[PDB]
Amino acid sequence: HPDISVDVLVIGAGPTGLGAAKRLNQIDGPSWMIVDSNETPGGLASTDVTPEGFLYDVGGHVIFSHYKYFDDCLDEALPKEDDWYTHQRISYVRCQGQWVPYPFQNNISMLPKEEQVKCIDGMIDAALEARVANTKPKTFDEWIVRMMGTGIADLFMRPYNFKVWAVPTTKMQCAWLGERVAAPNLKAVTTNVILGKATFRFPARGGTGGIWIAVANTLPKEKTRFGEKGKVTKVNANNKTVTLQDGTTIGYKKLVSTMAVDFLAEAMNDQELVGLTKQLFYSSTHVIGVGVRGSRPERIGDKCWLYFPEDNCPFYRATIFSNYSPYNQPEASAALPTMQLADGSRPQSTEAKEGPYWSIMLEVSESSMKPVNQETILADCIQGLVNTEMLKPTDEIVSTYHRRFDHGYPTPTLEREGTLTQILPKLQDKDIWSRGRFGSWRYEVGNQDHSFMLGVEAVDNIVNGAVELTLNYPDFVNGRQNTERRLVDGAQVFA
Amino acid sequence: HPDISVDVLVIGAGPTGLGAAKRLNQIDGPSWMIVDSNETPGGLASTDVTPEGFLYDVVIFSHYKYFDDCLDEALPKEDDWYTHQRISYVRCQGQWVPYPFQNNISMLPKEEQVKCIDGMIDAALEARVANTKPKTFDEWIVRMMGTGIADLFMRPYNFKVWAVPTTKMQCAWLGERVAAPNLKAVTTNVILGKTAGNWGPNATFRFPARGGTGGIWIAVANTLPKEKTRFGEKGKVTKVNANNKTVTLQDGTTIGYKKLVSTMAVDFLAEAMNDQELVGLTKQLFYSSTHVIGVGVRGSRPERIGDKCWLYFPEDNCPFYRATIFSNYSPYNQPEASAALPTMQLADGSRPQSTEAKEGPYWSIMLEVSESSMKPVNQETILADCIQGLVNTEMLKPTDEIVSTYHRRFDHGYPTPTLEREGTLTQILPKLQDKDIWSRGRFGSWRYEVGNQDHSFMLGVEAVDNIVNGAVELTLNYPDFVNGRQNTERRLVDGAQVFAK
Amino acid sequence: HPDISVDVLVIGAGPTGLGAAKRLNQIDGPSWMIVDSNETPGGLASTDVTPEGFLYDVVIFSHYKYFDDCLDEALPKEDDWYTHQRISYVRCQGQWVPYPFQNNISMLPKEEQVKCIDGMIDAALEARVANTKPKTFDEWIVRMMGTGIADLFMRPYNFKVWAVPTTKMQCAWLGERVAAPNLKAVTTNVILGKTAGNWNATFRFPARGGTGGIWIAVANTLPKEKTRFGEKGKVTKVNANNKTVTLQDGTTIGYKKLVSTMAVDFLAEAMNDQELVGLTKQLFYSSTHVIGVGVRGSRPERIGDKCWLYFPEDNCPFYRATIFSNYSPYNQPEASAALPTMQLADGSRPQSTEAKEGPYWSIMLEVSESSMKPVNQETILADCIQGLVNTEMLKPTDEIVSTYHRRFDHGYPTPTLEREGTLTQILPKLQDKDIWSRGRFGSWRYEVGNQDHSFMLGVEAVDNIVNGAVELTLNYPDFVNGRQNTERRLVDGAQVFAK
Amino acid sequence: HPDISVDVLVIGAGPTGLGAAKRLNQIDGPSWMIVDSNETPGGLASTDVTPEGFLYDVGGHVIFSHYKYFDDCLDEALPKEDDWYTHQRISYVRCQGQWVPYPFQNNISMLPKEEQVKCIDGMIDAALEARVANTKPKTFDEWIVRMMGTGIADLFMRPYNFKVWAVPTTKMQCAWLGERVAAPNLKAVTTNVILGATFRFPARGGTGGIWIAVANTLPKEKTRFGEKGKVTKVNANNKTVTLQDGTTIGYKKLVSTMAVDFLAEAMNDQELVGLTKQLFYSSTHVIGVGVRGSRPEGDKCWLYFPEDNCPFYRATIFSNYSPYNQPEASAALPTMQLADGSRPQSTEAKEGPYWSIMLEVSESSMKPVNQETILADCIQGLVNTEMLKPTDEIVSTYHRRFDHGYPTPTLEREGTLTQILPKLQDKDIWSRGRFGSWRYEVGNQDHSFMLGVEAVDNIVNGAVELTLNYPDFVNGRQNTERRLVDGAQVFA
């Protein structure tokens, strides 16, 4: 008999695993335990802090929630109104000196007139083709052109997605975008050209990763195992037993694995699965943070992401992270020396001066098809912020952050579903629910609300026979209000 | 304080309520009791038997492994079921046209084949440039079949079924399959002279060996704890007080609940709630009544009848819309050959030679005739008019000897998918939901397309699963989703019951 | 035997009849004579002059090098003609919108631009899956422009022209060009805010005499003795069975083949044929009021170098206006001519009845009349002058020195849905009796009813009588209009091979 | 001044040139003369006779006349009722042992049921594509498949046209087929599957008897046929042509009916020689077989052969057209060979009756033809296609090869042609005809006859050359205006 024995074992305490844990803890039926190699729960949804006191999310923030169950877990973890800030859900595209509001096509009235013509002409061609279309598009690129036409495709969605995915649009599938038919709204785009013409909540303290620390605090501490004591090293699927760094063995009846599915295959010493997982493609992500002295720029004022399709900066999206919360960066009274100016030069005084401060966060993608010079990427990003007029050449940088995440994005390549329906059934037959951004490799359910629910539904499947709707039918869950599953169900009321 | 109090109360023990019961009993969490005014479980899915021993139902295909687990529990021996191919035909112009109708029009006159194919070319070319969804049932038919084939079968037949025109019915209930024709399939079978039907060795169904269909539900209900049931006059509901969450029975016993699953017809529920708003709305729903007529025949089954199973009648020469050779489904649906029965009449109406009781063997026909305000039915002659229709459709020779007759009329037969149905229904169910009432079933939730036995059984399962485990009511709200997949996740033994040992 | 006998007899010396005559005179084979009830050749293509010296026609574009040859012969010096760019506008919502209308809707309010483009997007998407031809003129319009652009111009305007709704007219007469929109063209000028018209693209106009001066010159090339114009040449009876026509003075002309240029309904009456009279009475037509206005001053800049103007709106009775004074300085008196002001544009009396000098300019208007849209003969002149003020062509203070008003009973032969059904009963019957009934009202087909087409109807009718040539213009308008017709010339091989 | 001087000079007395001659002679205005290197008028529409008494047309027969003017000229040449035989217009395709009536697609009910399915399946695909098409077809092959679908294209029109033209269908244009939109009549094809107008021919002389008769109506002295009238030099700049014998004929306008590449050579005009050499054309082998017996148990038509089992693309039972196309039954002839290739037993001259088959095989730079074996290969082909029994007795054979047979409607043809003909137009040369202007679609006899008439009508009377420039226009109407007796002649 092994060291510890449980019914369902949860590996990993990012959002997926915490979902699995929260539902196991709600049901309070089968015994369970959650393990993670990091002392701090939250996975890639965590928040780092520089030596100078600037916070940086690793893996974005939730701008829309699809599940009342997700909301119920957040409300429990952070229950006071002074725990959250409310911001308008907006975003902009940086295109030819302009900040073009989202969605890009409804705002091309900001571009030069001659360029509007090329855009509308392309969309007319798409609209007429769409009138006689009788096939689904097969590649992401096909989807883009059928939706936007060539003009708008080339200005934003084509170059932007190469910077994001680090593979061409011609090599990616498009089922992941949803079942909305790939046609343009010519009347809307043209009308806005002719005329010349909804919130989210963010944690007040802790950054996004503070949510998951708070959520994890609701679990019984004795049923958790975080840090070096809980790193998994071997998974023996045949004896349903897991071995840890310190040699502790955990036997299970059913297993929810949240770790990257290729790492699971390596830890299983299963060469069939290793061969399969190596067919999956992914990009790595450089997260770069820049802390600046001063008040923020006038023209980049609200709490959003910014998209950069153009060649004059390495990053694909940036956010003025200091707008999300005053607690993401130091008080103005804190004294910090200027490390450098934005143009690259050393400062006048190395004296520690007061604030106030603001903060920019960037993302650069890397893959085998788009390599990245690691030694210059931070400087190249800072130059890009000067090129996009987000920093003046004279701005004082007081903090820099740069971390590289090997598994950044799971790529929706053409080959992905073919590979994945060989992997997930094979692990299913061994009683392993591999779920998550990299547990099941589907980006379109890979943000925080979807990932959290992948783990809830996986447990709901193990105990209560529920359908894994998020795992298998994203457009279904994304197209409805999921109000049925709640943190207090009938099952708990009736006891 | 009331007489009995439970967490979830199920009204009605037809397939829907038994689903609710099977799942409440599986979970074994909150207390419950199921009531029905009928001493015999099964509701309108039960089986009658004539004084002469002929059984008559009021046919399955299973979309859920949960349904399979419960049937396999109720009737577990291989000798409890018979397996048959899904054989069906359309009676059209002297021919038995195999289903699907459009793939077999090679049996009609050549000049008529030309009109059919011409209609379908027009449909195929329109479908190539279509950019709207069909809005009425009639629209859907013509886009699928073209004018010719629509007029021969699906237009007239559905009027006999539903007793309303195809132009006054919606079509979301048929699915999201785009309304286009397979011109090549239709055209190829015409060219080849081929006659192939939509059945085969794996296109089968199972039927209960004994008891008829209603024997399934007797068996299913037998697995429940008897003390948690209340069937018969002792279980008729008369008042449902939604505001104090208590229902009153025939004998005056009061049952108080925390959640209510109502399998009774929603117009009757509204009446029993003394709620004039809800009653007003339910009276806006449309429905037709159904006459079931059974005929027992002396002889071995005719070669003309064959292995046939259901038959469709779009034409004017008989009152019924569907017929079944019920005697092919099971040898136990009619008496042994050694049983002696007198001939009651011949199919042409004349008296037999002797009133003597002669032996069999026997065979059995079941018919269905619909009645509504726009299509009335003479209660006093429909049986005779049905038997004449059997002679006209060449199912009986004038000389066949009839040894048993059956006729029952069911007030609530089909809930009609009218254009107005969803408009009304989305006012009723939210109102009943706010009073903590899950009205589910063929008439509990009034949606025909999830109204056969497997869907309704699961309507009650999912309603219980929603009440307890926050599951989505997928069958109730997304019929095309459940119908397009194999529903393997919910099983009669889930993890929750395994992990309790 | 009758009084005169010829091989081909041409009745009427409008452009159609003069065509037949020019060709009969060229071939110089069969004998012929041309007759007309008007002492002045040119028919409804003539030019009137007011007592005060302002000329008024009732604009050419030539599809035939033969047409050019006859004009170039009649008026051969360069100073017999003036050259102008093809400049026309639509008066719409206070703006002069350059033609073609749809390429210039950028002058309309933005909210209205949206309705137009949205209507044209619908039109383009329908056109992408169209598999039928339009059946009515209205159908043709909407398929070309969409609802929005159709309602602003081509629908209301064509009603003012034809005095029948566009749904009751056919559209084969517009040609075989597919009825689809150039959405990219329209949408691009809206985005850029551009305006441009379809004018290096010129037309020529006679320097003196107006348009009817062309036809005077052309008629002068004929042998005088082969004509009979005036009261002496009015035809009163046409006896189709004895192939003889009798004149006002009782003179009988015998013919072997007859080219009748007069209105075919009058032809049926003069043939005393009750079957044909019934058939011709089935044809529909509209009457035309021509109104001329002479104004004092140098021409205003608001008018500019404009030429014809189209008026789809309800605020003036006329459908088209012409700045006749821009075509030629000799269409109105010199500045040194002295004339009294008759009235101001607002209706009031002038200060003095003294005759002041010029310069002058000249406006010409057209108003249509039919049983479906009547016209008050007693007020139309005043209603027109008010229309000029409402459309900002005249300021209320502009001084009018000449007014002109003539009404033409047979103005436009209407391309109704029923026209060809009727016409394919009338023309074969008159053909079997050896009568080539050709022309704007001789054959009643508007789309070949302007001057170059009509002149050639007469030429081709003769070429058919003598040389078995195909009557291409009469029967295949889109064919002749879609090509350059360089083969027939005023000097053919037959004439070179005889000198 | 040269030896002869006339206003219009016509080179060649095929149907085109005789058209030009008939109209010049009717107008009777400008002086004119017509020359031909052949003593016998009719060009490639003439009729040969074997030493054994069997007639064979060189260049087919007219099955429909588009112009009342053509009819008037025929009616003059042969005015008696018993000068003509009247037969039904019809043709068949030999496909998988069946004689499939024309048009092929409306009669596929004769093919096996399984082959009908692929035909109809292919045509449904074509019908659905046509419903959303917005481009015209660009190649002949595009036209075929859009009209017939793949199945029916592969059984007949694709393989048949490769045997006719000796180029792939993908390398030919399709404007020459007309303005009829490239869509299928699916309902018609399907309805006939579900359910399951004459021409006249000369009684004597074969087709070439028409042109001898039409030519007989001309004034003899204005003609010059034979070695005396072969043209050897064309000096377009001094408007003079030189003959075989050194005679010079000077002209004011020239109607050239000879093949335009030969005209370019006689002009010693290297610009034109280079341009004409870009035109593609195929040669034709005409093969006749005279057989002993009565005809096999049909009627007077052409037969089309898309399949691999015979070299020829079309065959006709020429003997059905007229009894005078072959000897009387009382005529004695020895059997030359059997259809199987063997020589007969006796050199005995036996009686008839007789019948006659005429074949056509094409040859081009992409499709060579063994001149020494093609006759035997054709006779075998007649046995393979069940037109001859292996034992039928052949009493006469005919084989002549025509270098300029068909002018090929290649994709490049119009691009090349709009450089040649306008250049010759400026030199006052009307190069018209089957090879004078190289357009197959107006290369049959009525169109060619009218090419010459209209060319004269343009030179004299300024008429539009409608047939040369608008074949679909003339083909879609009845051309009744130009007649052999016009007003111009009545008024004199």
Ligand SMILES: Cc1cc2nc3c(=O)[nH]c(=O)nc-3n(C[C@H](O)[C@H](O)[C@H](O)COP(=O)(O)OP(=O)(O)OC[C@H]3O[C@@H](n4cnc5c(N)ncnc54)[C@H](O)[C@@H]3O)c2cc1C
């Ligand atoms: C670059 C980036 C941008 C993002 N942007 C957004 C955004 O804009 N909006 C949004 O809503 N979401 C966003 N996210 C989503 C969010 O970061 C992820 O969904 C989150 O990581 C949830 O995935 P997960 O729990 O399945 O896996 P993870 O959180 O990646 O991993 C789960 C845990 O498993 C642990 N683990 C791995 N191997 C072992 C082992 N052997 N033993 C023990 N533990 C192990 C890991 O240490 C980790 O703690 C983004 C993510 C990234 C990477």
